[PDB]
Amino acid sequence: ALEFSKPAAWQNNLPLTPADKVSGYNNFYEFGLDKADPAANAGSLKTDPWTLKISGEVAKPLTLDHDDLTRRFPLEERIYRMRCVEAWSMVVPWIGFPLHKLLALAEPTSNAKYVAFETIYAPEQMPGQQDRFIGGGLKYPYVEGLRLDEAMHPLTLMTVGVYGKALPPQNGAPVRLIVPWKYGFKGIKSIVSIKLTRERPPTTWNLAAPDEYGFYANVNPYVDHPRWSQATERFIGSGQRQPTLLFNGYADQVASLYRGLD
Ligand SMILES: Nc1nc2c(c(=O)[nH]1)N[C@@H]1C(S)=C(S)[C@@H](COP(=O)(O)O)O[C@H]1N2
Ligand SMILES: [Mo]
Ligand SMILES: [O]
């Protein structure tokens, strides 16, 4: 349980996704393929102590411990929609601080062009990292990345809590990335490492299905997925079809960094 402010911009009147579901229906392959596997097995993960290490193309490499996650930077509550590529979405009241405040501390160098994220590796604690089938064929640890300007966008945040309290392990506690305008797979869980690199780093779902998932993965209703239309989505409310929005509804805040490019 923790304190936080509620900035005007991140507050709205969007129908929330019941906490039961936000923490009961998850994708966390390290704990199994089914939507219920994470909530049923994430209990085995030891999220305290913790070590989040910021390295690479940075002038001041730092390192945060479990307490730093909730105490080092001022926490905020942000109500973002969360759109998974599988075509189901939610509206979650996340709690965290913008990645740019952490990156600013580290002072990235003039050669930093990307941010590479990496999930913890603890095979005997995460069953999926032990069985090809339990784990889904992913090459562990789970890894992700963002262009520096994306990582620095005010909208992207290091999440440490949901629904007023610290994160249940199923949601990737103690630290998880959330990039609202992109498909869920970009929001890497239980981050133990953030490295600024010179080249575009590898992405776990891109590696596993190069033909289906890309690096940008910007939520877009006009571009389909090899196996399904992205035009409409299944909203997880209480107890549900609705149109998918351009940039998951953040087009005005984000169009700026993609305009005029590939
Ligand atoms: N390490 C790790 N992080 C991960 C995943 C995973 O399987 N392993 N899956 C995700 C996918 S595809 C989505 S859509 C979100 C799910 O967020 P949630 O469970 O918190 O709702 O976590 C992403 N982060
Ligand atoms: Mo996803
Ligand atoms: O996703």
- Residue 254 tokens, joined: 């984000």
CA distance 38 to 47: 15
Rg over CA atoms, the chain: 17
Q: Which two tokens stand for residue 215?
A: 């690096």
d(CA 67, CA 175): 11
SS (H, E, C) 241-253: EEECCHHHHCHHH
Q: What is the CATH number of the domain that holds 198?
A: 3.90.420.10
Tell me which residue has its CA closest to atom 14 in ligand 1.
184
The best mutation among 189, 236, 244 to test binding of ligand 1, ranked by most ligand atoms within 8 Å of the C-beta, falls on 189
Residue 216 alpha carbon to ligand 3 centre in Å: 12
Spatial separation of the C-alpha atoms in residues 184 and 52, rounded to whole Å: 21
Tokens standing for residue 214:
């890309």
Task: Count structural domains, the chain.
Answer: 1
Residue 74's Cα: distance from chain center in Å? 19
Q: Record the resolution, in angstroms.
A: 2.5
Return the bridge partners of 91, or none: 81
Instruction: Report how far residue 55's alpha carbon sits from residue 112's, in angstroms, rounded to the nearest whole number.
Output: 11
Angle at 27 between CA 173 and CA 218, to 5 degrees: 95
Give yes or no for a contact between 231 and 219, defined as CB atoms under 8 angstroms apart: no
**What residues make up the domain containing 45?**
1-262
Query: 195: which strand partners?
Result: 55, 116
Contact 2, 73 (CB under 8 A): no
Q: Which pair of tokens denotes residue 69?
A: 């996650």
**Sign, CA torsion 178/105/253/13:** positive
Q: How far is the CA of 160 from the centre of ligand 3 (A)?
A: 19
Beta carbons of 200 and 59 less than 8 angstroms apart: no
Cα 186 to ligand 1 centroid, rounded to whole Å: 8
**Which residues are in the CB-under-5-Å shell of ion ligand 2?**
27, 84-85, 184-185
CA 96 to chain centroid, in Å, comes to: 12
Binding region for Mo-molybdopterin: 26, 29-30, 84, 119, 171, 176, 187-189
The encoded tokens of residue 249 equal 């509804």
* β-pairing verdict for 232-235 and 88-98: parallel
The separation between the first and the last C-alpha atoms of the chain, rounded to the nearest angstrom, is 43
What would the 3-class secondary structure string for the chain be?
Answer: CCCCECCHHHCCCCCCCCHHHHCCCCCCHHHCCCCCHHHHHHHHCCCCCCEEEEEECECCCEEEECCHHHHCCCCEEEEEEEECCCCEEEEEEEEEEEHHHHHHHHCECCCCCEEEEEECCCCCCCHHHCCHHHHCCCCCCCEEEEEHHHHCCCCCEEEEEECCEECCHHHCCCCEEECCCECHHHCCCCEEEEEEECCCCCCHHHHHCCCCCCCCCECCCCCCECCECCCEEEECCCCCEEECCHHHHCHHHHHHHCCCCC
Instruction: Give the whole-angstrom CA distance, residue 149 versus residue 113.
Output: 8
The two tokens of residue 152 are: 């620095």
